[PDB]
């Protein structure tokens, strides 16, 4: 068996599996073992199809650590036109065995760079967010037909008002994938004459030879004369394979290596900074021990021993701000929905009932009061009349346990005594039943969280004594006989209750005593610490990070304290209420109609109610605060409290709100739903009957040792703890919030400044109805990768998501507010999206976008000038002389009797259908059927050419050989007919093909040409020839292979803002994620 | 609008929403008007949701 954690094991394979949790080399989540008994408890993930003899993890945990084997890149090079050439050197010969020449690049006529997300990878759990691109000869409209053009009149085009939204969602998917730590996988030494003595990497799988040439362009030699074999001759030779390995290791393989392989800087930078984020959450099992020992408030001592290592990682450390923002999201979940509050309070009630040493026995009242009694002979006795109300039955005491559980959640739900627990019809002193109803009510009131409970306690008696004693009031319509249930808001508090000197003891000698007893002996609030502040954080809004505001005072706990302790606050309260109820009856000033002297029976049974023994005022004062302190850090919804006040009318919290907008802005008042309550939160009725029975009867077992009971009861609910999964989830929530405020401000008008990278991609001033639809796709893309099925950013989407910073606040009575604004820490997914937006600003081409505009005009010639890159002869602008800019009111008047038809210049003139023109793109969508009726005969035949200024546009290609005829009208007119007022089909080009030998010279007619430089996604033309005579030539791009051709360059160096490189250092890891073990020992 | 067809009413409501391709009298009117006076331009959003 195991001597570390003292667990009994059976097979030696199970011993080698069990020491792996301790870190000794030889599907669980937590593995705890007790010290006094033999019962290990093991958590396991809840999505398993066959759970057995184990415990479940019902929290929605995110999948943080996810590994990757394979190439760390996202750019693949595809061939577009295949073309094989005659070859000089065919194969290598060692002795007799022949080896085929494998090329790193596709030997084709035209090679281009397309973007497929990871395209060669071995992954245990995919993120389900792929940016997959077809080659540019195929259609490329489904990538932009994604978010908001869901009603489109043309199902093959994309809405031009939504380019920025679709592109930002694409960049969010590109950053939200490649969230992988790559895996160290094992090597193999080479002795090829072109790669001599270099430990090359080898992928896992059936064959390792498959990927060597695709990785390493150096490894293929220079056997012949071609565009690759004059490149490898320029390349350098000592930079391939492993560069630097770790020192410490296990077995033979190292902990981390630096390898040279094909990659790209844009992926390896995102993965490096993602690793740098996850390494900053690393926790120590010694800190786990400190956390649980400090959190248990004594009563146990955990321990978690381990073996010394560095490669383990246990990401569990967050900051207080990242905890508080997720607390604000959990508060915004509710929105006056009592359904999302009910199971929380009910299950905390059941748990708090089953932990507690106290059982509420029924027999204490029954061994004293005796239903028999019949003092008089006419009607019921006082002793038999109180039992008909108390009803000491064993139904339940949920109205007591939920009242205890409601102390934790003050700013959400408030506990009151239900209506029709008060005296019926106002009540009168002259009746027997209403006195006991007032007794039950005034004994049950001080456990509610209602801050107007003392005013209700006073005005129930002041309502009951109408017609015997008079008090002054203030209004002449809020008289003395107003029902005590209606005093639920602190503006209703009477001045006669506030200053008790105005109650004259001549007129009200009993109401004066009651108003004095409330102001003297009402219970005092107090506070106690819980949890750990340094580890686990603290979700405490408006309170210091380790306090638990209780509405009752507490002393240190012992069991041998006397029951009739009048220093105890609730016992003092019971004694004073019984004494005033005695002094009311003693005189018979207030009960005429009692034809017999019931004052002896009444005074005797009130003496019995005063001197009853019950250890619930002992329990609520000693052992209930430490149990709340033990339960409270292991909750899904950690306690949201708002400060308790005793009688301070100047500070009573009346309203709690959550603010989405910024600080230095003035917008519409978007008050949250939680402000629309009469009380501070959702109301909650409780029965005073069961609360009073619970106070009057409750005892311990006779063999109560606290160090046995609590060390026993703490252990299973810490074995099923869920603090760790919540700490993992709050990072994802607090990261998604900042991702939302960074991405929505790019497409809407918000004064919040973040860096504004792409503007030339056109879009619209988005309203709330558009921004909410955008943010819903952002939300589900955040959820799909991190494997969640519960809330994330979903309370944000309840109208106006155009927001800046979360903030929460309440106000007092006197108007003083409190604004708690948690500072936003460093986000990671947001500034990775900003980095890839900066990089997309420089390669707009590789994702299928061009800059600039379109010139539609007939160019008929022989030349091979490749309309992705035009000469300056054909292009013009606003500054070109003799060019007519057209505004919005382009109006066409027909010519009469042979005159030419004219169109309205924006300067007010009329110009004929001739020359160099300028459109905005919006005009052609305003009048798409009227225009091509008028303009197509002049573009095709006449001298009319038109600039269409549009910013960004997707595009597709059509190659032709220039040995034959070519005409672009059947494509150009097909593009111009299909532009509808709500979408654009992707702009069709045709560029020539490149050849090595010289060709014929056939005429061609081109209409749609670009204006600025666009031929960047093209990798290399005619890759196997020595050169390219006719056509657009392109060598291998030497600026992307920097660390192979620049001899003075450190291998870390990356030119990532300007152009991403495709080969650099990447660092592969072999970490360990052990489960979370502890040995829970009991304390004497 | 609520009703059988709100498709018809969107040209009755907004005259300056149409395009101006013509030198017809309707379009001579619409081409000489102010752009930013359509739809809602003021609101009172007192509570979220």
């Amino acid at each position: 068996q195991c001597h570390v954690c003292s667990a009994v094991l059976f097979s030696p394979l199970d011993l080698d599996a069990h020491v792996a949790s301790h870190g000794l080399h030889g599907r669980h989540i937590t593995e705890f073992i007790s010290s006094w008994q033999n019962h290990p408890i093991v958590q396991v993930s809840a999505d398993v199809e066959n759970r057995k003899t184990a415990q479940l993890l019902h929290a929605d945990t995110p999948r943080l650590v996810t590994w990757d084997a394979g190439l760390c890149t996202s750019f693949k090079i595809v061939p577009i036109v295949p073309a094989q050439v005659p070859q000089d050197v065919l194969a290598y010969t060692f002795f007799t065995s022949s080896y085929a020449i494998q090329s790193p690049f596709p030997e084709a006529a035209v090679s281009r760079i397309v973007v497929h997300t990871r395209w060669a990878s071995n992954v245990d759990f995919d993120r389900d967010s792929s940016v997959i691109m077809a080659p540019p000869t195929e259609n490329n409209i489904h990538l932009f037909k994604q978010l908001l053009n869901t009603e489109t009149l043309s199902v093959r085009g994309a809405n031009p008002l939504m380019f920025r939204a679709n592109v930002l969602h694409m960049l969010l998917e590109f950053v939200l994938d490649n969230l992988y730590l790559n895996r160290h996988t094992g090597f193999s030494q080479d002795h090829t004459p072109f790669t001599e003595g270099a430990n090359l990497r080898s992928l896992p799988g059936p064959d390792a030879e498959k990927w060597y040439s695709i990785m390493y362009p150096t490894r293929m030699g220079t056997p012949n004369v071609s565009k690759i074999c004059n490149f490898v001759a320029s390349c350098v030779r000592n930079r391939v394979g492993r560069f630097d390995r770790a020192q410490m290791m296990n077995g033979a393989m190292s902990e981390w290596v630096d390898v040279f392989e094909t990659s790209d800087a844009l992926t390896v930078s995102i993965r490096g900074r993602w690793m740098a984020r996850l390494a900053r959450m690393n926790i120590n099992p010694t800190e786990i021990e400190w956390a649980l020992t400090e959190c248990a408030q004594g009563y146990v001592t955990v321990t978690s021993p381990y073996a010394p290592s560095v490669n383990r990682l246990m990401p569990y450390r967050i900051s207080n701000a990242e905890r508080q923002i997720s607390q604000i999201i959990r508060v915004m979940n509710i929105g006056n929905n009592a359904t999302v509050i009910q199971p929380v309070l009910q299950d905390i009630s059941v748990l708090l009932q089953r932990i507690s040493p106290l059982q509420i026995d029924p027999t204490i009242i029954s061994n004293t009061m005796s239903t028999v009694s019949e003092s008089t002979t006419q009607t019921l006795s006082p002793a038999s009349s109180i039992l008909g109300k108390l009803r000491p039955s064993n139904s339940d005491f949920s109205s007591f346990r939920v009242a205890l559980a409601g102390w934790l959640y003050n700013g959400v739900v408030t506990t009151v005594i239900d209506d029709s627990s008060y005296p019926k019809d106002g009540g009168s002193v002259t009746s027997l039943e209403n006195l006991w109803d007032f007794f039950i009510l005034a004994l049950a009131l001080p456990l509610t969280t209602d801050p107007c409970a003392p005013v209700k306690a006073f005005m129930t008696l002041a309502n009951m004594m109408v017609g015997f004693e008079t008090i002054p009031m203030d209004n002449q319509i809020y008289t003395q006989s107003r029902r005590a249930s209606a005093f639920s808001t602190p503006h209703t508090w009477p001045r006669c209750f506030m200053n008790i000197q105005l109650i004259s003891p001549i007129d009200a000698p009993i109401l004066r005593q009651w108003a004095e007893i409330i102001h003297r002996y009402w219970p005092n609030p107090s506070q106690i610490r819980y949890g750990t502040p340094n580890v686990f954080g603290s979700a405490n809004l408006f309170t210091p990070p380790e306090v638990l505001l209780l509405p009752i005072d507490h002393q240190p706990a012992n069991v041998t304290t006397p029951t009739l302790d009048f220093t105890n606050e609730l016992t003092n309260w019971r004694a004073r209420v019984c004494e005033l109820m005695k002094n009311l009856v003693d005189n018979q000033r207030y009960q005429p109609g009692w034809t017999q002297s019931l004052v002896s029976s009444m005074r005797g049974t009130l003496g019995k109610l005063k001197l009853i023994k019950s250890m619930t005022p002992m329990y609520l004062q000693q052992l209930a605060p430490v149990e709340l302190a033990v339960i409270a850090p292991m909750l899904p919804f950690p306690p949201f409290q708002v400060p308790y006040v005793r009688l301070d009318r100047d500070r009573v919290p009346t309203m709690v709100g959550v603010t989405r907008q910024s600080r230095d802005t003035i917008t519409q008042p978007a008050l949250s739903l939680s402000t629309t309550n009469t009380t501070v939160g959702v109301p909650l009725a409780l029965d005073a009957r069961a609360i009073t029975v619970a106070l009057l009867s409750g005892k311990y077992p006779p063999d109560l040792v606290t160090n046995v009971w609590y060390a026993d009861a703490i252990y299973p609910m810490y074995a099923d703890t869920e603090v760790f999964s919540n700490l993992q989830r709050d990072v994802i929530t607090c990261e998604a919030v900042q991702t939302l405020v960074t991405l929505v401000a790019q497409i809407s008008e918000t004064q919040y400044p973040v860096d504004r990278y792409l503007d030339w991609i056109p879009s619209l001033r988005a309203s709330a109805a558009t921004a909410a639809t955008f943010a819903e796709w952002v939300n589900t893309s955040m959820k799909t990768a991190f494997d969640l099925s519960d809330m994330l950013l979903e309370p944000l989407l309840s109208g106006d998501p155009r927001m800046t910073q979360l903030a929460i606040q309440y106000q007092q009575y006197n108007g003083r507010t409190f604004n708690v604004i948690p500072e936003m820490p460093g986000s990671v997914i947001a500034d990775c999206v900003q980095l890839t937006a900066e990089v997309f600003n420089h390669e707009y081409n590789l994702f299928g976008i061009a800059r600039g505009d379109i010139i539609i005009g007939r160019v008929q010639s022989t030349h091979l000038w490749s309309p992705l890159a035009p000469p300056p002869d054909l292009v013009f602008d606003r500054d070109t002389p003799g060019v007519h800019i057209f505004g919005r009111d382009c109006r066409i008047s027909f010519g009469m009797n042979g005159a030419a038809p004219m169109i309205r210049d924006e300067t007010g003139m009329m110009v004929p259908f001739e020359g160099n023109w300028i459109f905005p793109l919006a005009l052609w969508q305003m009048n798409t059927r009227y225009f091509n009726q008028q303009f197509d005969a002049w573009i095709k035949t006449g001298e009319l050419r038109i600039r269409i200024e549009m910013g960004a546009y997707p595009y597709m290609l059509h190659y032709y050989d220039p040995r034959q005829y070519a005409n672009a009208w059947n494509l150009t007119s097909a593009w111009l007919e299909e532009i509808t007022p709500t979408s654009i089909p992707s702009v069709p080009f045709m560029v020539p093909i490149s050849s090595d030998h010289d060709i014929s010279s056939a005429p061609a007619v081109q209409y749609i040409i670009s204006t600025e430089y666009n031929d960047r996604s093209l990798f290399c033309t005619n890759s196997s020839s020595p050169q390219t005579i006719a056509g657009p030539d392109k060598h291998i791009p030497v600026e992307r292979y920097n660390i192979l051709t620049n001899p003075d360059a450190p291998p870390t160096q990356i030119q990532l803002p300007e152009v991403v490189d495709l080969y650099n250092v990447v660092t592969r890891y072999a970490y360990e994620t052990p489960p979370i073990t502890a040995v829970v020992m009991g304390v004497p | 609008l609520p009703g059988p067809d709100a498709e018809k009413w969107y040209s009755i409501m907004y005259p300056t929403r149409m395009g101006t391709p013509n030198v017809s009298k309707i379009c001579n009117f619409v081409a000489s008007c102010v752009r930013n006076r359509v739809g809602r331009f003021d609101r009172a959003q007192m509570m979220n949701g």
Binding site: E151, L153, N927, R929, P981, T982 | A6, Y10, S11, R17
Partner: peptide, 19 residues
């Protein structure tokens, strides 16, 4: 619903081919 409300606003003003 919002999809119907947007689709009517876009389909209220479209234009077709001549006869």
């Amino acid at each position: 619903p919002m999809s119907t409300r947007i689709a009517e606003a876009t389909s209220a003003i479209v234009s077709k081919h001549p006869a």
